[PDB]
Amino acid sequence: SGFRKMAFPSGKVEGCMVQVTCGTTTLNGLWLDDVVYCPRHVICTMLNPNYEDLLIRKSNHNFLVQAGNVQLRVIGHSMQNCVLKLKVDTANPKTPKYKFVRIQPGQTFSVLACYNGSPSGVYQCAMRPNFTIKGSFLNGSCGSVGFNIDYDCVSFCYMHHMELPTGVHAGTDLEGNFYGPFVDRQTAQAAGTDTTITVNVLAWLYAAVINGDRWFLNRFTTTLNDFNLVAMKYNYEPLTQDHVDILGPLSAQTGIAVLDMCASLKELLQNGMNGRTILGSALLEDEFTPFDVVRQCSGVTFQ
């Protein structure tokens, strides 16, 4: 019993973290096979950089790459969108089975926060509809990564580049393409309007039911259309039928049809919890996907 915001075991990713220094800037890189991936702004010195030019100047030896104590000789270098790829003379023996994936807003992943090539800690978070994440990142964390694990395969989805004036965070996929409309410039860039991930809240309510919190379960039902109208008023993402279907397995487990839970959520948005808590929380939690709930409640393990 019990429901926690659980992160993936981090060891497979820990074994890939390195430190990358160019001139005076040091940030984190990701060492897979004989390539180190890192954010390209390590070659900055930055209000508007011309990264292709800065890279003509730079030669391999200008990149100091340290894997713990060991220095790794850079024998080649290239750029792909906003990430630098440093070919090194040594393949990482701890490289896991891996993919690069681009996630969708609403999906979750674990962040391994690193400084100077060493891990500080791990937590789970959601890609917000506005393509930001509400993380815990200080200066020097750039190049920390986000990931999911599927059995033995690490799917890297996020590399950290920037903190916005709002104090939320923004970065790229491992092909260097930013999530959302940001650029890797030392300029102030505004977020974009966020909304709550409605399908995730419903998953979290099924998790509550599975654990034992049911007070919020109202006797009524509703239509997808009617619900999506009450949602718009409270800044909630529209629920699609793809979402309704993703919730089917939880619905079948708990004996509660999706539209009934939709009724029960519709109430909460209108009356609040009146001092009550769901799974130890007093706000409606939207950073658990339906998969996350099934994983945690089923004891799914990795390898």
User: What are the residue numbers of the active site?
Assistant: 41, 142
Instruction: Indicate which of ligand A1AV7, a copy of itself, none lies near residue 90 (CB less than 5 to 8 Å, by partner kind).
Output: none
Taking the least distance from each CB to a copy of itself, the nearer of 119 and 238 is 119
Place of tokens 């019993």: 1
Instruction: Indicate which of a copy of itself, ligand A1AV7, none lies near residue 112 (CB less than 5 to 8 Å, by partner kind).
Output: a copy of itself
Binding footprint of a copy of itself on the chain (CB under 8 A): 1-12, 14-15, 68, 112-116, 118-123, 125, 134-138, 140-141, 163, 167-169, 211-212, 277, 280-283, 295-297, 299-303
Instruction: Indicate which of a copy of itself, ligand A1AV7, none lies near residue 93 (CB less than 5 to 8 Å, by partner kind).
Output: none
| Site membership for ligand A1AV7, residue 299 (CB under 6 A) | no
List the one residue out of 6, 284, 292 whose CA is nearest residue 124: 6
Taking the least distance from each CB to ligand A1AV7, the nearer of 12 and 161 is 161
Taking the least distance from each CB to a copy of itself, the nearer of 213 and 262 is 213
Binding mask 139-168 for ligand A1AV7 (x = CB under 6 A): xxxx------------------xxx-x---
**Which of these ranges, 98-106, 136-144, 207-215, 220-228, lies near ligand A1AV7 under the rule CB under 6 A?**
136-144
Residue 272: both structure tokens together:
């609040």
Instruction: Indicate which of ligand A1AV7, a copy of itself, none lies near residue 40 (CB less than 5 to 8 Å, by partner kind).
Output: none
Which DSSP string do the residues of 235-296 spell out, in sequence order? Answer: TBPPPPHHHHHHTHHHHHHHT--HHHHHHHHHHHHHH--TT--BTTBSS------HHHHHHH
Task: Looking at 63-221, list the stretches that DSSP marks H as alpha helix, in order from N- to C-terminal side.
Answer: 198-211
Q: Residue 291 contacts by C-beta under 8 Å, 6 or more apart in sequence?
A: none
| Site membership for ligand A1AV7, residue 179 (CB under 6 A) | no
Which residues in the chain are immediately followed by a break of C to N over 2.5 Å? Answer: 45
Task: Give dist(CA 270, CA 266) in Å, integer.
Answer: 7
Instruction: Indicate which of a copy of itself, ligand A1AV7, none lies near residue 303 (CB less than 5 to 8 Å, by partner kind).
Output: a copy of itself
| Site membership for ligand A1AV7, residue 137 (CB under 6 A) | yes
Helix 224-233 × helix 258-271 angle, to 10°: 30
What does each C-alpha distance from 130 to 113, 133, 137, 251, 286 come to in angstroms?
22, 9, 18, 28, 14
Q: Shortest distance, CB of residue 86 to ligand A1AV7, whole angstroms?
A: 17
Q: Shortest distance, CB of residue 258 to a copy of itself, whole angstroms?
A: 24
Do the bridges between strand 153-163 and strand 97-100 make them parallel or antiparallel, or are there none, so unpaired? parallel
Q: State the residues that interact with ligand A1AV7 by CB under 6 A.
A: 27, 41, 46, 137-142, 161-163, 165, 169, 184-188
